[PDB]
Design a protein around this ligand. Sequence first.
Ligand SMILES: Nc1ncnc2c1ncn2[C@@H]1O[C@H](COP(=O)(O)OP(=O)(O)OP(=O)(O)O)[C@@H](O)[C@H]1O
Ligand SMILES: [Mg+2]
Ligand SMILES: [Zn+2]
Lengths: 595, 222, 189, 566
Amino acid sequence: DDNTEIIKSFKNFILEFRLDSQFIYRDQLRNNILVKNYSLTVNMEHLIGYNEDIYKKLSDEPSDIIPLFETAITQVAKRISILSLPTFQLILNSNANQIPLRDLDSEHVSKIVRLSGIIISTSVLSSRATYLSIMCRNCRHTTSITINNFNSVSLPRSCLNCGPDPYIIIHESSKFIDQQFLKLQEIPELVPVGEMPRNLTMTCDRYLTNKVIPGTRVTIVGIYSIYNSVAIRTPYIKILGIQSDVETSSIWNSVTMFTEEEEEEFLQLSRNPKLYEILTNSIAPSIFGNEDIKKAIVCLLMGGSKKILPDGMRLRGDINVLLLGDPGTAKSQLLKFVEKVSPIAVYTSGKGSSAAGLTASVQRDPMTREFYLEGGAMVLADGGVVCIDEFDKMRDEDRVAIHEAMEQQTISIAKAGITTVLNSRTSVLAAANPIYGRYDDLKSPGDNIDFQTTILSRFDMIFIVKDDHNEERDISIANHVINIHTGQEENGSEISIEKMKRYITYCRLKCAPRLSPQAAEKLSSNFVTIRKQLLINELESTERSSIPITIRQLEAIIRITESLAKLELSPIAQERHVDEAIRLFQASTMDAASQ
Amino acid sequence: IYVSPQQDFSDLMKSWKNERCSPELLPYPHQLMKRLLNRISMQSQLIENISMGNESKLPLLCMETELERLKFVIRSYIRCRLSKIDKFSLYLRQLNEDENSLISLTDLLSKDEIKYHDTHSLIWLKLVNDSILKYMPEELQAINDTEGSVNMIDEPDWNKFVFIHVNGPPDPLLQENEFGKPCYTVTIPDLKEEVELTIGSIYVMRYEVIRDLLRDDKVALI
Amino acid sequence: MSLPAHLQQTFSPEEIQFIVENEPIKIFPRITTRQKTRWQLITTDDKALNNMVAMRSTEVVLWIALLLKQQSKCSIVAPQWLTTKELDRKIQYEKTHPDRFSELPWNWLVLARILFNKAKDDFHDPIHELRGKIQDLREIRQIKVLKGLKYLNESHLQLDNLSLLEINELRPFITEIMDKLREIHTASL
Amino acid sequence: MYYGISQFSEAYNKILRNSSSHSSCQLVIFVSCLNIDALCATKMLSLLFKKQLVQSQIVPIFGYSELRRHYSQLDDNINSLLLVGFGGVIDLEAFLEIDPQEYVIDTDEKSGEQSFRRDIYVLDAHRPWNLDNIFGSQIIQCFDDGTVDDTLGEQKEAYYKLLELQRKKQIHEYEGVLEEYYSQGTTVVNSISAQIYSLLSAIGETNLSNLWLNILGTTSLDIAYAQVYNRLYPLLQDEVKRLTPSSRNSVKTPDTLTLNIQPDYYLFLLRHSSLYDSFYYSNYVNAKLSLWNENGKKRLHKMFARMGIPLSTAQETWLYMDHSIKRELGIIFDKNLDRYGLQDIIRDGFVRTLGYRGSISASEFVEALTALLEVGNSAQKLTNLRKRWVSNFWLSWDALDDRKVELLNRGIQLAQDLQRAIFNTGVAILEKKLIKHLRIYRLCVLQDGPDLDLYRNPLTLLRLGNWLIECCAESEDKQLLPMVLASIDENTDTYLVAGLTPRYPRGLDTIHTKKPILNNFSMAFQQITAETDAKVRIDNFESSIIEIRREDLSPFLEKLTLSGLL
Ligand SMILES: Nc1ncnc2c1ncn2[C@@H]1O[C@H](COP(=O)(O)OP(=O)(O)OP(=O)(O)O)[C@@H](O)[C@H]1O
Ligand SMILES: [Mg+2]
Ligand SMILES: [Zn+2]
């Protein structure tokens, strides 16, 4: 009765909506059916413009009208693609105000809401039924049921004598769809005073599955509903749309999510003669000086290139950076910026961490009594960067639990039957203090550093930041900080965080330069000289150097060269990059070792 | 055979479309182009004369716009012809060098086109002989060799597929089909197949087979 | 070289519009040029323009008609195939004959786009209805083209009553795929 | 000379007759870079000339120096020059060094008139007319709106007699009346767009787009010269009623264009922001509630609570707001507003809808255009800034085309940003009590604000000035006193002073409120600059705005206070 009229109304929107000379939804449908994507994304501002009455119904009773807009889409799709196809999914976009995760309460039950959060977990896909074929136990009578996944359905209780519940499902004739579960945590800043962050369970269907990964900020449009698991119901959100700032699909598979128009911008930016300067200036615009550390951070974000030799050996392609220095140097602020610019990043404190917190931990499911594996900081940061602050407060065991994941980029587990070798391809950016809090020049370098040579050799570049009291520099820093406190270039000398992050993603998924012979000869000669320099320094002092120079440093120089080449989308690394890489190595690691 | 300016424009457009879609370099319509250029000059002089001297505003606008249209058509036609000459320079040189061949460039090209062909060939040969060919032995020193592993002279794609519209005569080759409609019969020797080309229909045919019909104006490429 | 790579072997949409704009159309002059200066053209006929009378049907080239309409000195008379009823009939014909294309003119899409853009007050039917009908017809013909593309082969192929803009859209794919098929077949022998 | 209301057709025919030949361009239009009324009038004229195929050139122009430069750089093939939005007050013949003899083409003794190569047409709404242009010159042709005939007879008589010349007494009294006429201040009496629309109606080319542009031009004067808008409103209402189709029973279609006269409100961008933000960022609401302090916010929250609108609902954007409250807004507002003194928010305005798109009102369209003009994007830096503003002119001009809607949305966003910045700056000004209340005028000088780069544009400075004029100056039952606002820019170490006329309490019809208030700052500023070695720049079209050096402001203001002519 009314259902047919509602279906007719939503069908006329898809067939009559033109903003100029193009039918936006009719053409979107045809283009989607051609690539086998049975869905239509509709913007709710367009529906409020066609007929406000249709929006009033879709917002007053969402779980009753949404199922009738899907069938209208399916009918129009059949009319457009078939010359005389499952039920089509409807994905919604809205610009309504976002309700804070913790402000959702009884006043929003069964209503369309928009909210943001952080995805902390994702489930293994399940299978939900969409068309059952049933039969009767006694008289063997065949029937079918059709189900929409919008709850306010079960097998018939009485046959069509036959006892109660006479119907058994015939599986080889039924059809199913995909279902996923997500946990959404509220943003750290939104949380009220003295409160732990709160979770919320979410479910997505069909083409909204496998769209997010744990640890990524997302925006959700859905229905705040309830399901019975006494007179209380556990709330949850039925997703109707997902929007994210991270192209997770490009990151897991190939290069994707870059439009040709967007791609053209990246090539134009790469063609800039002084992209290195722009990127260096774009990191921490509010921190004065420390240019070398900012260049090192650019190289770390860019990364090197990984090689798999024919015999099977793999060569690490990531760069690890350590910041040792005195208080007030802005190491923690640099780490907090790097966590915010990188596409994937985790900020962790060495004190509030553990060996299982990093890597992976073995957990027991209370229901199935079965042990399973949950990823830690280094798994949650896979393919990105881990910012381990307070690296000196970490316990010896928890620090030792990081060697293999830092070098081999794998997390071997052998616990509770579970036996595996996970993958953790992450870059470590660590900040630490010397033993006495300040780097005391009076005592030998072996007295100011408690890190063992094994852990230190795993860092590509080591920065020993010393705070020297110079009146000119002090006045400059005072002026800069006061300007910050009392007080937008965007004129080719700096790019916002979003653009820089997208450019990092593009470069990582598009380029992997290789060394030319001249660079190889140059780097090889430099390694021989540096090793001789360590030996002359060692012969002079009975004490064995605390900062080592092993083959890992040669590989680190190669990685820095490759990252500098990749920064400009150059398929080959030339001497103009080798010189910069050698300069950075001398400015950080040989500088630390010389003292 | 001159008929009227309208007919001359119609043949110009026919030639333009055929040249754009054809794989080979068609013969140059000397008389038509001569008439068209002379008419262009005369019409330009007439427009200038009239302009030198408000109801007369619109006619002048129309004449100038028509002159622009005609100039554009001729420009595109000549540019396409020059590009084709660039692609098939060695092939045309081979035609001229052979004496048994019927076609001669003085008939297949205009004076400007022949001048362009000779000058550009000389320029490119100078460049390549300086850069590369002067180092190779005497054997590999020819820019037009056909006895090597790969033939260096590019010939037109004879069997290229081209959309055609069968518009009939403005006839011995014409006949009727089972349904009674007029039609043409052609044979594809590669497949030994005979294909009917009924009038008023659109086909995607090989160029070689319908080449004679195109030359006689029985079909026109779209 | 002399010719860009995107204009080689095919025409651009502007070239198709240029070709379409030389066909005659019917206009109602708002001025009386007939005498009881003078047009002097060389690409078309000028007798019709020299003989115009207010509110009297006459035929001129499409581009001249558009130029006159820009001055509010003529009202273009839309073709007979571009009425609501005729488009309904063509849609029905397409629906009942899954294996053939309707007998629309070879310039229906281009002329529809030009007249909708330029002469919006010269139609006797609401413009939105005509736009919807043309969209429907385009979708049906697109379905038919998609179905018919499954019969590409090393021999000829026939696409009757397919318009100029659609053929221009499909020319690269069809020609290149059939050329590759022919190359494979010929290599076979 | 001057062209009466009925002579606009004659002037247009002259322009067509002379500067219309498909061989070359012979028309040039100069436009005030920062005047919306002139922008709309020039758009109307551009469409009108495009219809008749007249080749032209449009040159945006900031200040008189640029005008002189461009006129000097004009070619000799230009037959007609159009000036829109300026030129009436200055002496064009003297200023541009125009010698009538040099510009003469042919002279006929029998006719008694001379023909000139060039003609200059003045489309200006400012007053008073410069009697030299109106009555003495012939190359200058001024588009009058009846003032010369209504209220300039005695001045005409005096000027003609003075040119025609015991006699010392008559000469003295005539120069005295002329000086009395020149002593009065400057004001705007009409809208240029209305004049161009009258021309179009005279020649019969009025349509819906032209009416939209006319409405935009006329409504651009609502904020300042409300008394002109109130006078021109009935004609716009009649035109909208005449052009609109009688029957509206037809349903919306993707092409339907609607132009209604619905209840509008004195709220800032009501239809593109929340109901809360419209009240919060409104000049009138802030004036009548003092939102710049906490008590004002408490009072606004009390008002919303009384009206029955939840705070969460009010802060929701316009499109997605609960529709029951949206429908009832007219009823809820009418009973509730009178209690809080915000009753005059109720108004009737123009709303235009394009099928299946959001409906936008004239006031919000004007706000978007102005915002695009303002923030759309030694002498060298000044020239660069003026070039940037000339660039912004074209963004604002593009925003007038229905094919460019992204530009309009971008303008609305920028307008919201600018209003937020103006609110913050006004809060900083009022909290610190930076306004000095002297006996002749009020003064306010900004020296260390946080967003001082914004106020280099005269338009943004006038926006802030209007905000201040409404709040705690229009109200408080204080005597009407003109205000001076100045701002500094370290990049050039100079001030941008701007005198502002006082305004009567809004929506208070009275005999004294009926009388208009003039702006005398031009005369006093010029007198002081001439007397003192000021180094002042008086090149801006609005004579009330000048530029001063960092170290001259104190002497300038001392002399201003001592002048007594304010
Ligand atoms: N250019 C700057 N250089 C140094 N500190 C800065 C700078 N700009 C701001 N700061 C201040 O630095 C403080 C952050 O501490 P910072 O990151 O410098 O410590 P750290 O040296 O890494 O740590 P710790 O003192 O524990 O060794 C913040 O208060 C920030 O205001
Ligand atoms: Mg710290
Ligand atoms: Zn049973």
